[PDB]
Amino acid sequence: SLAPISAKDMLDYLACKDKKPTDVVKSHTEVENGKIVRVKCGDIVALVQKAREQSG
Amino acid sequence: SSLAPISAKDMLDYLACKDKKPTDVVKSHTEVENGKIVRVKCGDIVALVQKAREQSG
Amino acid sequence: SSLAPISAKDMLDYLACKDKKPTDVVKSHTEVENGKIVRVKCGDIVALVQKAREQS
Amino acid sequence: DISTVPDETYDALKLDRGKATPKETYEALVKRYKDPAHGAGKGTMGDYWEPIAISIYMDPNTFYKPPVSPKEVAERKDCVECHSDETPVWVRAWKRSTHANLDKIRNLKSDDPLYYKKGKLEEVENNLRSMGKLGEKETLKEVGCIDCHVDVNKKDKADHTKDIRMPTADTCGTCHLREFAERESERDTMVWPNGQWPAGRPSHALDYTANIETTVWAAMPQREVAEGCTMCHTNQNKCDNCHTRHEFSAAESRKPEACATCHSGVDHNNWEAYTMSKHGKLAEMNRDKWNWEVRLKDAFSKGGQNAPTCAACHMEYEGEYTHNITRKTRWANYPFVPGIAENITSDWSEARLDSWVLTCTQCHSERFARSYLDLMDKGTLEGLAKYQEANAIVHKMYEDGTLTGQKTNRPNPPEPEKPGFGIFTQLFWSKGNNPASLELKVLEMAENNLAKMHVGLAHVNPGGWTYTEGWGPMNRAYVEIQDEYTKMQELSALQARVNKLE
Amino acid sequence: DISTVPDETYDALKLDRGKATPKETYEALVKRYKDPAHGAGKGTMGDYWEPIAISIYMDPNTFYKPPVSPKEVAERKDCVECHSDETPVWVRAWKRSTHANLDKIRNLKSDDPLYYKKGKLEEVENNLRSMGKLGEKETLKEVGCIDCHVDVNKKDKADHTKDIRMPTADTCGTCHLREFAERESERDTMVWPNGQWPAGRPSHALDYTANIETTVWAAMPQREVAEGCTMCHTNQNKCDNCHTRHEFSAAESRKPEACATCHSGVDHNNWEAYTMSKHGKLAEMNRDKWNWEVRLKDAFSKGGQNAPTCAACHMEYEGEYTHNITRKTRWANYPFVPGIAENITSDWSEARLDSWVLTCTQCHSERFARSYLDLMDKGTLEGLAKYQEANAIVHKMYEDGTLTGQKTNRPNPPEPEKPGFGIFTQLFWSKGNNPASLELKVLEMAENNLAKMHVGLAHVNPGGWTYTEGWGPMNRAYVEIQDEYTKMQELSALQARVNKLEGK
Amino acid sequence: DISTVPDETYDALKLDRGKATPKETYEALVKRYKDPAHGAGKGTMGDYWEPIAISIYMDPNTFYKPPVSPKEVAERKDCVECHSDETPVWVRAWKRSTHANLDKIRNLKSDDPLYYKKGKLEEVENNLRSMGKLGEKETLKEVGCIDCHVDVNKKDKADHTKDIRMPTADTCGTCHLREFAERESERDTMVWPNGQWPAGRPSHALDYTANIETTVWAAMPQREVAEGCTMCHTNQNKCDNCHTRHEFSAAESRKPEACATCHSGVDHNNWEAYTMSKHGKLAEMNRDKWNWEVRLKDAFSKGGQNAPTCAACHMEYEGEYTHNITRKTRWANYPFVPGIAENITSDWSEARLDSWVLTCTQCHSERFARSYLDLMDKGTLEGLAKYQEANAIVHKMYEDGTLTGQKTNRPNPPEPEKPGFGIFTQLFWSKGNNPASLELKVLEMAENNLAKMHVGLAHVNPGGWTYTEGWGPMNRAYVEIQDEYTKMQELSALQARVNKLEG
């Protein structure tokens, strides 16, 4: 059974493929303070990686 | 003159009892109480309908 | 320039009165009050329209 | 005598079957047809509404007068020649129609599947000769502009400003007596055992009367909105809604599409349900394989038709096909109409069911047909029970006077409507909190979603009574009704606590 | 060997594909097909529901008995003769079918685009010889009423009251072993890497099992409503839903309309999405120019087809066509199913993506197809995100016990269902405030509107994921959920202030 | 002189009708067509959004570059041979098409209804000679892959990685100058008397510009959602939406189904309304009796067509047919747009009504046509009145600051959008209580249900402005708006009473 990853986190992971850990991408889903949220690729990759380690 | 009003649930129970004995017990088609489908005795619904058929002549 | 705003109900009444006397009374196409369709004196609606055409 | 017209029609017109002529039958039919007491004219609420421009085509017998221009005196040939410029396509459509090619119908040979048309032409001539419009040995040359729009078989000049009419049901009925009589016989066959609906209704014969006798239709100020209703309700007045002007093709009227403009929508989605069923999906896939020109009686043999259609199912009765669509009606679309559910077990309804079984058993086994029709009846009642439970809640609130705005913002409907709970008027007129949202929701639960549920069942579209129409939408209405009721109960209790703090 | 049947099917049945005869393959398939442990019969909740009159046609192997009338015995020709009056159109449709004109198929020449049928007849005959239902020199004379409805190639009389059956998948499969085996192979090919769905599902092979194993279907009292679900879920039991009785036309089953009655509606609007797309509108416009009689493999050459169809896309796999429609399935309609979104980046899903791309390149370039399928995947996740944010709100209320009527008017669902939050049962059963409006709204947001959004994306109908279906309706749900949440928050705040005024 | 192109177009192009050559007219049209100031490119909000993969096909002139592989250098014949299994149906569809069969068009006889195509072939050839793409004594052999995808009448080899392009409107217009010019003339003909809509809009000429100049489209993070809008708005950029690649059949584009993918749905249900009308049901029933290959001008005579279709109604203007679809537009779908209702009785709208009457009177009498068009206008206003009453309630609440969460949970929309009431943005973006339910409801009442009411009226579908669409759904919105309004007043008064007890 796959450990749960939210749809927004999935989008951000997709957006960060073939890119550097320091690179920043736009969110596909999130707006805060009148602007599309920016995400660092290192953070989303890491969060996904700790979920693949907890998956069967 | 009009027919006496019979609720759909009573109409369903009455139909569920066609070609059945008055002592036969059928499931409701509409009612759930206490996590179970309500059971209806055929004799009881037939009597309820007969009274209505006699209410309107 | 830009047209002075006229409500749809007023446009309707103007249309219903577009070929008759200022003294004539027609029914509303939209308004019901006191269980009856509102009656409109044609002079009142044409006057309200003509001032708005002037302001255009 | 007309073989396909029932006994009860002749009796209602005071006619003897074995004695009455086409002329006598026509005149009696029309005498009832044009009688205000039998539904003609503006109706009982005619003082509340006035015609609009389009109304002259919708009810020509009440409202039509020819145009002031052009000021033209014209012969038969002049109609065709001038309108070749003025309304060119009407001429081209007419020119390719049977009406304009009667000699082709006379030339039909007995090995032509359309041969029946030759006999139908001769019956038309028999009718006209009986009426004195045609000589005993004079062939009907054509049915042209002047015939329908002025007078049948006219030989002389017509005044465009005086003699032009819009052709009504009785105009067509002059020649097509059989079909007009069949249609009018709906007045005499559609009689409910307990007056569930008014006598002769529902039907195409009284579709216009029903429209103008609807209070909100007469009462509402939005005439152009009200007239949309009229457009679906004109069969009584004119015969061109299934086989349209100016081709008047019988093949066209046989296609499911001919019924779709009227028999569709939120409160009777017959088109939607039928097309989505296997029956209708097969009709779509196979339409190029079937001969639509063949008469209904021959559809399943000569036509090659292997799936049922609106016309084939609804015009069929006890092995015969007629313009009467009322004789097998049991549910009549709206399952909540008082007396309808209670009547489903009666010998009257069972006899009509037997007639339906006969219809289905042209293809299916009786066991199969009765298996499904039992499902249809019970599924319909199951829907009705769901609505009735929800209605008990909202109706109690109404009696309690607790509906939102009921005592503070509930203005009276336009005259001559009387105020009440969950009435038809509230679908076409609203002001303030008349109706309340709960009131409209439970009305729509029955009027729209229960009706579509039944239509889904009757026309064999599974999604049309489960997920998509019927059960699914009725479930939401039920849930939302219970939710608002509970919310309004606790808010009432909260207002009571503030009340006893003051 | 059956060349179009996957290895995993022979492995599951413990058959050697190089050795097994048609008879052995058939018998192993049918043994699984008719086994209650593999899905046949009334299922795990069989004590909770009883068949209705139509159920004898929906699941014949469990429920069908022949009619008591007529009380007659009949030979081959008596079927045709009596039914020619009793069910006239059935005999008429049968007469114009391939089944009743097998000699026409034998006389097909090599320059006829329908020549493939001659080979299919010969294969059918070989199957029947292997099974001992046909002699080695004996040709199959016809497929008539007695054959499907009593026994294949029956030589004597049948008792109408005893011997009549409704032909099920195994009946057709006696002759059409290839198609039956292809269909059954869905059991073995539709295996999810993490058990996202039960093994072999979703599929036509287990549509009936899936139906009767749905709690609310078995639990609800409105049997006639439940049997409407059944009517869309009968492929497992009978083979006449795409190519209907009694013409059994392959051409008909290739037309998009054949899939429409089942693959439509509020929670999977495939027919609506497809027909509105350019693909579907072109199919509508060009249907008369195409030769529907040619096999799917010849559709784009001999057929003249220039727009894709349900059958051509979904029965295609790696350049071949089979009755197995499961091998390219990635999203499986409902994007909210646990593990489905998380699985979209796996090698398993990526390989099935390559297979889809292949399908598209019949016409489009690879680059074009990959560009759009990327859009489909991401658009789907964007919809899922919207739903998930909304669900967090209503689910929190459930945890808090603050849903309308949750503690005062939330009766338990009918046995054997267990109470819960936003469960499928609440779509087909409701009582009191089970469910609450907020709870149903967010359920339908995923079940209906998110699912239709994905369908719109998958089938290339732009309005079906933006304005009209998907995004628009999901936006409304989100807005209304937020609005009610806020209204209820300040109502409980007001109630708390009243509680303080009662402290006195 | 292209006599089907309006004076306004030549004037706006600073060209003389009689003197201008095909080369000159094409060049002037393309100069405007490709100018960012005239709508091309990424538009004014280009810094807020990035193209996705599919965008290279939606806006090729801004975004398209050929693929890095295959690394191939190919002749005219090589395009066909290799793609015959690489993209098989494209080759087969092309081989079926007129573009691949120009000699058959040359062999046409003057008594063939399709003979006009020979004149059009020679027109294309005349255009191309003027542009220097075709010799004075040289016939155009074919229109093959390399012509549209690389260069018209290319004689040599092409680099697949460098020379391949997506054929845009200007690509087609190199040959089909008449149609390209007619379509472009929408920029010059669609001018509103009071700027009800931007000049040249609504139109196919500026559909993509309209799309990218919509604030939410540029502002929203869900790019793949936004790009669904783009797919309905590509006519500006590419000419293959009515007559599709790679058959490019004119007969196809004449069929109502060709318009259906875009002209359908919750805020403009034209496909739905038309097909349900008698007009559209007749079109469904009679489609096999009509000769669709015949030009629109011949449809009602030589075609045998007896019921109207989208193309026949909307491409007709004063007895002629062009690719300009703007000249009879009066209501423009959305009846609530400021100035539209007020303009319905002007000389400008009346002249356009006259032009419609001419369209209808090919079949109906003038008296009939005018009677129904009066019903359409007045029914639309009646719908508008109903919405205006409901909007007065909700707009008041917004200005009073009394909408749910308005001061508590109304986050600002994404840049560069500004906050406001009942804005288009709130249909494609929402967060917290922006918008509120009441606000969305009255917005959709106008945007969706009033618009569909008008469409129903315009396309003669009684149910589509009464029970099922239009009046029915608007009635419910009104009812629910009034209901929530009253509930919220009652709750406000209850809150006021609790305030009193606390003070």
Ligand code: HEC
């Ligand atoms: C007349 C003398 C018949 C002969 C010979 C055969 N059948 Fe028949 N059949 C007949 C009738 C009147 C009916 C209707 C029964 C009902 O109540 O609907 C049937 C029915 C069938 C069916 C459907 C059974 C069901 O459960 O719905 C089938 C499949 C069928 N019949 C097939 C069949 C065959 C194969 C026959 C030859 C051996 C045959 N029938 C003979 C009348 C007559």
Ligand code: HEC
């Ligand atoms: C719809 C989803 C189908 C179901 C369920 C079944 N079949 Fe089918 N069938 C379908 C299509 C689209 C086609 C054409 C396939 C092609 O490659 O061209 C077919 C074809 C057949 C055939 C061959 C007939 C012929 O091409 O001459 C047979 C013998 C057949 N189908 C049998 C069959 C059986 C036994 C089924 C139950 C398991 C069955 N089909 C289901 C569509 C669908």
Ligand code: HEC
């Ligand atoms: C009703 C009788 C159906 C017909 C006719 C067709 N399909 Fe179907 N299909 C149906 C159901 C109820 C299901 C799901 C079964 C379950 O597990 O409950 C399916 C499944 C499919 C799938 C896979 C779905 C998924 O993986 O999410 C596909 C790809 C599919 N069906 C395609 C398909 C086509 C192309 C059809 C026409 C030829 C067709 N189906 C017919 C019900 C019915």
Ligand code: HEC
């Ligand atoms: C085989 C050796 C080829 C020859 C000769 C030509 N093309 Fe091609 N083409 C080929 C492949 C394998 C692909 C797929 C590239 C991908 O990643 O999808 C293509 C693609 C195209 C396209 C579409 C490009 C896109 O951006 O999607 C076009 C328009 C195209 N090819 C046209 C084309 C022309 C005009 C050629 C002759 C000059 C030609 N191709 C030659 C393979 C081959």
Ligand code: HEC
């Ligand atoms: C020209 C010289 C005409 C001749 C000869 C006939 N008609 Fe006519 N007709 C003509 C015009 C210009 C119009 C349009 C009037 C308008 O205001 O729209 C008509 C109209 C009709 C109609 C429709 C009337 C309506 O109320 O809509 C009909 C039914 C009609 N015309 C029939 C008709 C017949 C039967 C004629 C022969 C006797 C005939 N027309 C002659 C012009 C001319």
Ligand code: HEC
């Ligand atoms: C719209 C409405 C409406 C607008 C207001 C008016 C005035 C009517 C009136 C009726 C009445 C009355 C009935 C019931 C039948 C009767 O005799 O009393 C209703 C029926 C109806 C049918 C029959 C449904 C069935 O039984 O299967 C159909 C086909 C209707 C069609 C039109 C419709 C076309 C799209 C529109 C608009 C309305 N109706 Fe009606 N009508 N009608 N109708």
Ligand code: HEC
């Ligand atoms: C109505 C419902 C229903 C009524 C209650 C029942 C019991 C079912 C059962 C299911 C189940 C379960 C699923 C999930 C798949 C699985 O294996 O567990 C559901 C699927 C479904 C599909 C497939 C959707 C897809 O993946 O693309 C189809 C086409 C369905 C359609 C029918 C339908 C015909 C209009 C009706 C009515 C229902 N279903 Fe179902 N089913 N179904 N279904």
Ligand code: HEC
């Ligand atoms: C979906 C929307 C959308 C998604 C977000 C965007 C950005 C657009 C843009 C527009 C604009 C702007 C208008 C107004 C016209 C103008 O020039 O300013 C709107 C119109 C529209 C039409 C015309 C309706 C009419 O007048 O009859 C049509 C046919 C539209 C269709 C597409 C559509 C296809 C199903 C999708 C998705 C959207 N639009 Fe649009 N558009 N559009 N649109």
Ligand SMILES: [K+]
């Ligand atoms: K056809």
